[PDB]
Design a protein around this ligand. Structure first.
Ligand SMILES: NC(=O)C1=CN([C@@H]2O[C@H](COP(=O)(O)OP(=O)(O)OC[C@H]3O[C@@H](n4cnc5c(N)ncnc54)[C@H](OP(=O)(O)O)[C@@H]3O)[C@@H](O)[C@H]2O)C=CC1
Ligand SMILES: NC(=O)C1=CN([C@@H]2O[C@H](COP(=O)(O)OP(=O)(O)OC[C@H]3O[C@@H](n4cnc5c(N)ncnc54)[C@H](OP(=O)(O)O)[C@@H]3O)[C@@H](O)[C@H]2O)C=CC1
Ligand SMILES: NC(=O)C1=CN([C@@H]2O[C@H](COP(=O)(O)OP(=O)(O)OC[C@H]3O[C@@H](n4cnc5c(N)ncnc54)[C@H](OP(=O)(O)O)[C@@H]3O)[C@@H](O)[C@H]2O)C=CC1
Ligand SMILES: NC(=O)C1=CN([C@@H]2O[C@H](COP(=O)(O)OP(=O)(O)OC[C@H]3O[C@@H](n4cnc5c(N)ncnc54)[C@H](OP(=O)(O)O)[C@@H]3O)[C@@H](O)[C@H]2O)C=CC1
Ligand SMILES: C[C@]12C=CC(=O)C=C1CC[C@@H]1[C@@H]2C(=O)C[C@@]2(C)[C@H]1CC[C@]2(O)/C(O)=C/O
Ligand SMILES: C[C@]12C=CC(=O)C=C1CC[C@@H]1[C@@H]2C(=O)C[C@@]2(C)[C@H]1CC[C@]2(O)/C(O)=C/O
Ligand SMILES: C[C@]12C=CC(=O)C=C1CC[C@@H]1[C@@H]2C(=O)C[C@@]2(C)[C@H]1CC[C@]2(O)/C(O)=C/O
Ligand SMILES: C[C@]12C=CC(=O)C=C1CC[C@@H]1[C@@H]2C(=O)C[C@@]2(C)[C@H]1CC[C@]2(O)/C(O)=C/O
Ligand SMILES: C[C@]12C=CC(=O)C=C1CC[C@@H]1[C@@H]2C(=O)C[C@@]2(C)[C@H]1CC[C@]2(O)/C(O)=C/O
Ligand SMILES: C[C@]12C=CC(=O)C=C1CC[C@@H]1[C@@H]2C(=O)C[C@@]2(C)[C@H]1CC[C@]2(O)/C(O)=C/O
Ligand SMILES: C[C@]12C=CC(=O)C=C1CC[C@@H]1[C@@H]2C(=O)C[C@@]2(C)[C@H]1CC[C@]2(O)/C(O)=C/O
Ligand SMILES: C[C@]12C=CC(=O)C=C1CC[C@@H]1[C@@H]2C(=O)C[C@@]2(C)[C@H]1CC[C@]2(O)/C(O)=C/O
Lengths: 327, 327, 327, 327
């Protein structure tokens, strides 16, 4: 049976199995009014996890997220707000995981969010120019300063996450509680094989992103790049190329076969994809993305699909994908 | 000879052998005017220990306690105020011993109390969803932040209290100074056998609660549930059932025999019961409960009974109760 | 050659070899105007060390000391202000070295002093009811909170000071930098034998008090208790009895012989006594006491006596006193 | 190829290979208007490193630097501001590396700078009267207090820097990230031989000063002390004597030969000297000094000289200097 709320890794932080992200949309692709409606729908449906980053829309995503929280007046204690730090400006010192940028970056993010603290502050990616000890000491400092409750990693290799733990235990600092990693039918290796090891060894939880591979898994690009789609937005040529790549067309081919299973289960492809991401209880929460209310409500409906993901169905999906990693 | 003031465990915190609790009464069963009178009587009689919790009357108990302190103008340095954290709201993240709720919960409690800090912050019960290290780190954090002077446990098993100590010594954090445990003639095992071990091994003190078993030991329920009694209050059906249970009637049977001893000593059953709780010097303080001034003054009179609790009397009481635990 | 300024123990805090205390006088025996003049004379003569305590004149000494500092406008960075904590009120919890009283006591002292911090906060005496770890953790906390730069002990045995060091090194806390001990011709054992060991082993410095044994060494009580003398003040019967005791008269007998040496050196008995206290370079600073400007200026003149304290003179003084401790 | 921005030692702090210092000039030799122009030129040319000290012009240098930052409105996150502590006043306690002066000194510097924190706080020189542990604990404290991001040493021997590291690792404190050392054609030993060892062993970076030996390397003193030159300023007789010393004239002799190489490379002597200081990648940044815009722009032009410092050129320079240290 699905437990809607679960611990993020071994930490005491309880999050909904689904969260709502703000990449591309908040302060960018969608209006603040649409953003307000989406967050309200999420909150009213039990979602307590909202993710953002200092880099999203050059800080505007955080401003919008913060405005909604203040306008709606929801109790701060009922929300789990997370933000990621790494890209905070054009100046040399305004990027990275140095103590200087972690403190300056988080302080600026909190100011934009109109919050005293975030529940989890994440390193948006690894920093090849800053030693682990400095970063872990900085993360520990902002937590001790009450600017964050916990910290986590994103896009870090399992060895790098273990290195952070090593530094934390050697210098009696605070270890990370979660790794925010990409997870969907076409990106499974890290989450299915590596993360479970980190959970058992050092309690690291898995909060996944892009469950629909930026919308690709929806099947919407089955015949070209639809107008208004993310892949058609300015600054997202990389996504369009990926979709139009040889491999991208392959993916669409497999999606048609997966569509057959969805109809069979009585759900949509996106609902099948999102439910699939939560099938295994190694994933603490899946961060959703949505440009409108129809998509968000559809996505939230993935919860009803879970009970239907039998061993046979899963095996059938693995046969189609043909990318089941080795354990 | 009885020493009215004593250290709470091995810590330097000095508390009166009797304290006044706020469960059921403050902000609930009794008026704020009655609450003011009761706290004033306690304070004027040397009591410096006052206990509350974020969950009592949904925060109203703390508001009332805080209003009295401010109105009476007693020096903060002359008071020992304690509050318990665990149930702070209906949202998923508003309960438990996670760092998030410990900080948010205590901050909200202090705001209601109109205090900068409590002397002891207690975990109201064990949290099966939060690792010990997180909880001990959080408790240590609020103490270092000046929101609490010390921390303690409540309703924790002796192994769990030792686990908190283990974590504290392994990561150089602050260990707990006290366990708030139930203690009365019908619940003796933990306080008489387990707590003494913790005192000698890790200095944990014992602050006990419900010395009259919610009023049962008073003998008032000898013939049914009296009107206005706690057991007749809305939301306390559990107490009524307990009193009307097979075991509950048994307890009343033994109380009649204990009543004979009380008359013999020239005191009331409640005074005998409370004095009994303080007979052994393993108990640092007993938290009293009272819905009116007659009960409180009667209860405080238990101090004069102590000198009379001879070895013979104690043995006689053990014979009647027949529940003397094994050491 | 005498170095007027020296390190307090092995710490980096530099103090004048003479300091000015506030016991009995400030906010008590002398007017605030006299207090202002005395502190000004001290400061203008190079003294940068001023000592007080929460217990002196029930907090009034600190208020007077603070008023003078604010009125004169001396740079805070040019002063070394020390206060002692232990007796802060009539309530049970308003005394001792518990974390509660150390924090509440120092906070109240700083408020009275109108200062953000003291340079050294001292435990006024040992606390038999509070474990060392709690006290050292509390002292470390107020230093980390910026309420004090360093901490020290007073009236503690050399074993107790070593215990504080043990706790500090075991839990990585801050060790004490100084012990404020009584030192004069009739009380030499601890300072001459024990303190030097602590300096070499754990860097503890010696700041001494009552160099004239409350005025006894001045010879003023050679024929009874002079009017207006400290021994004649209300609340100082203990001093009068000490002076009028069999041992006290003995002391006066030896003082007459010491007076002969003083005349010979061309100085007064008090100057000889104070210079004697600084003869050995094991004493970092001697805290002076004075009820008027004549005494203070006389006392400060002890510095010119030092060059004259030859080995012969010292041996001659030891012969008269007959209390040279064993090394 | 030259990387304009580089890590300061192994820390995550990224600095421009050239920085601008404020010694002698800011708040002293040059007007605030000239200072503003120089800092603006530096900033606009990519320099993000600005150095000062509490002792420069008795605090006026920091005031001027702070006024410029506030007036220009540059983002704090785009700047790396460093200040040095040691000489903060005439009083005994207003100098040194004691916890008292480190905290009071840095607090006063920040107030003058109108900044909440500096990126790096440096000990301006070693303190023979303060134990290393006290100093490292104090440096760690101001960093934890958010008054500085990191700390460093200046003018410390390689053994003393290693001692700071030893203390930091023994007591789990923060180690230094950089040593600010003198480096130019006539002072090479420490930077070329000792500092590289510290970089590899404990990650300490090298930020060098006086690349032109106070202007001597410019060749301007080839025929006496030019009017308005630093050596002619009041309070700099020491520099004049050094230039007019036997050794100083020698240096000028070698400068004439170096001038030949400069012309050959198509650059000025100062550009050759500064580029020389950056030839080796063991130096993280070179702090420039300038009394006017012509000098600063000339100095910044040293960057174009680097590509020209071939092995032959370097060897030729070593032959002339004849002071190549032994590795
Ligand atoms: N740590 C990291 O580096 C990263 C973190 N994240 C986090 O994860 C969150 C989710 O990632 P995101 O890539 O947005 O998620 P998805 O992969 O689920 O893509 C969501 C996007 O796909 C489209 N879509 C969503 N639902 C449907 C539907 N039912 N039918 C058709 N199209 C649909 C929408 O785009 P459109 O309508 O414009 O086509 C929407 O914006 C982010 O907001 C962020 O918080 C994301 C990436 C990286
Ligand atoms: N840590 C934990 O989980 C717990 C902590 N506590 C703490 O302990 C405190 C005391 O517990 P509580 O259960 O109230 O204590 P008791 O068991 O002593 O019960 C007190 C209640 O019994 C009745 N009573 C008291 N004295 C007399 C008397 N002389 N004659 C007749 N009836 C009397 C009153 O109820 P009425 O008049 O309504 O019948 C009164 O409210 C609490 O306020 C709280 O601070 C309590 C429980 C749990
Ligand atoms: N840590 C601790 O427990 C203690 C700390 N202290 C500290 O030490 C300081 C000094 O101690 P205190 O006992 O006052 O010092 P002294 O033993 O030097 O006694 C000073 C007193 O003696 C008299 N006196 C001083 N100089 C002369 C003189 N030249 N001729 C005649 N009489 C003189 C005055 O008293 P009068 O004129 O009234 O006779 C004066 O108040 C205190 O203020 C306090 O800061 C002191 C005791 C204990
Ligand atoms: N940690 C420490 O103890 C020390 C740190 N420092 C730091 O290093 C910085 C730089 O040191 P500084 O000694 O000023 O540097 P330089 O050795 O480069 O000397 C700079 C001075 O030389 C002259 N000069 C500069 N460029 C030219 C040029 N192109 N042609 C002719 N004359 C020129 C100017 O003086 P003028 O025009 O007056 O002749 C200028 O003020 C300082 O500002 C400070 O921040 C410096 C010393 C010690
Ligand atoms: C949540 C926690 C504590 C607070 C925090 O900010 C970060 C972490 C991360 C790693 C956790 C840790 C614990 O609470 C204790 C854990 C969970 C540990 C990993 C192993 C662990 O050491 C363990 O399993 C004890 O049995
Ligand atoms: C554009 C960006 C920001 C600036 C930049 O110099 C380079 C990149 C590359 C990749 C980006 C990144 C982000 O902005 C954050 C992204 C987009 C990341 C990949 C995933 C990501 O990490 C994230 O957070 C998902 O939402
Ligand atoms: C009070 C204290 C210190 C402050 C605090 O917040 C919590 C505790 C709890 C555990 C205590 C501890 C001590 O002070 C030292 C003690 C009392 C210890 C248990 C054993 C102990 O280690 C001991 O016995 C030294 O002899
Ligand atoms: C109602 C409550 C709160 C909400 C809830 O979901 C479940 C319970 C159960 C048991 C309760 C608890 C409290 O509210 C606090 C209580 C009442 C506890 C038992 C003792 C207690 O721990 C305490 O503090 C005594 O006063
Ligand atoms: C001043 C200091 C540091 C700051 C402080 O608040 C208290 C102390 C007390 C004990 C000191 C300590 C030191 O700085 C290092 C010392 C001085 C130590 C005793 C021995 C020592 O460990 C030593 O000798 C190293 O050689
Ligand atoms: C009166 C006092 C305070 C109250 C009390 O219950 C008992 C005493 C006894 C001894 C006193 C003490 C003080 O007040 C501080 C004194 C006077 C101490 C002896 C030296 C002392 O420690 C000190 O500080 C010298 O100045
Ligand atoms: C920057 C740092 C961390 C923050 C800080 O305030 C000071 C330092 C100085 C020393 C550094 C340290 C590290 O981050 C880890 C380093 C860089 C270390 C020296 C060796 C090191 O231990 C290492 O090499 C791990 O591989
Ligand atoms: C004058 C000064 C300050 C006062 C003093 O009693 C003695 C000196 C001597 C040497 C000086 C010093 C400074 O003022 C800072 C200087 C000038 C240092 C040598 C280099 C220095 O350390 C520095 O910072 C370069 O800019």
């Amino acid at each position: 049976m699905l437990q809607f709320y679960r611990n993020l890794g071994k930490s005491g932080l309880r999050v909904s199995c689904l969260g709502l992200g703000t990449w591309v949309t908040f302060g960018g692709q969608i209006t603040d009014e649409m953003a307000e409606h989406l967050m309200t729908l999420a909150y009213d449906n039990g979602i307590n996890l909202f993710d953002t980053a200092e880099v999203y829309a050059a800080g505007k995503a955080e401003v919008v997220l913060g405005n909604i929280i203040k306008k709606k007046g929801w109790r701060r204690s009922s929300l789990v707000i997370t933000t990621k730090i790494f890209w905070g400006g054009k100046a040399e010192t305004e990027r990275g995981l140095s103590r200087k940028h972690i403190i300056e970056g988080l302080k600026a993010s909190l100011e934009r969010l109109q919050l005293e603290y975030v529940d989890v502050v994440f390193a948006n990616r690894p920093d090849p120019n800053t030693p682990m000890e400095e970063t872990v000491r900085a993360m520990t400092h902002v937590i001790n300063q009450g600017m964050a409750m916990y910290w986590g990693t994103s896009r870090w290799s399992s060895m790098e996450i273990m290195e952070a733990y090593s530094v934390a235990r050697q210098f009696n600092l605070i270890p990370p509680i979660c790794e925010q990693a990409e997870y969907h039918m076409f990106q499974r290796e890290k989450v299915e094989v590596q993360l479970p090891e980190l959970f058992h060894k050092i309690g690291v939880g898995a909060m996944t992103w892009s469950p629909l591979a930026c919308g690709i898994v929806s099947g919407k690009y089955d015949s070209g790049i639809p107008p208004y789609s993310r892949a058609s937005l300015k600054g997202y040529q990389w996504l369009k190329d990926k979709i139009l790549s040889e491999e991208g067309r392959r993916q669409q081919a497999k999606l048609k076969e997966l569509q057959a299973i969805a109809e069979r289960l009585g759900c949509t492809l996106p609902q099948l994809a999102i439910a699939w991401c939560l099938r295994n209880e190694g994933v603490s929460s899946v961060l959703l993305g949505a440009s409108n209310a129809e998509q968000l409500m559809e996505n939230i409906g993935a919860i009803q699909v879970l009970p239907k993901l039998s061993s046979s169905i899963v095996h059938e999906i693995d046969s189609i994908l043909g990318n089941k990693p080795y354990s």
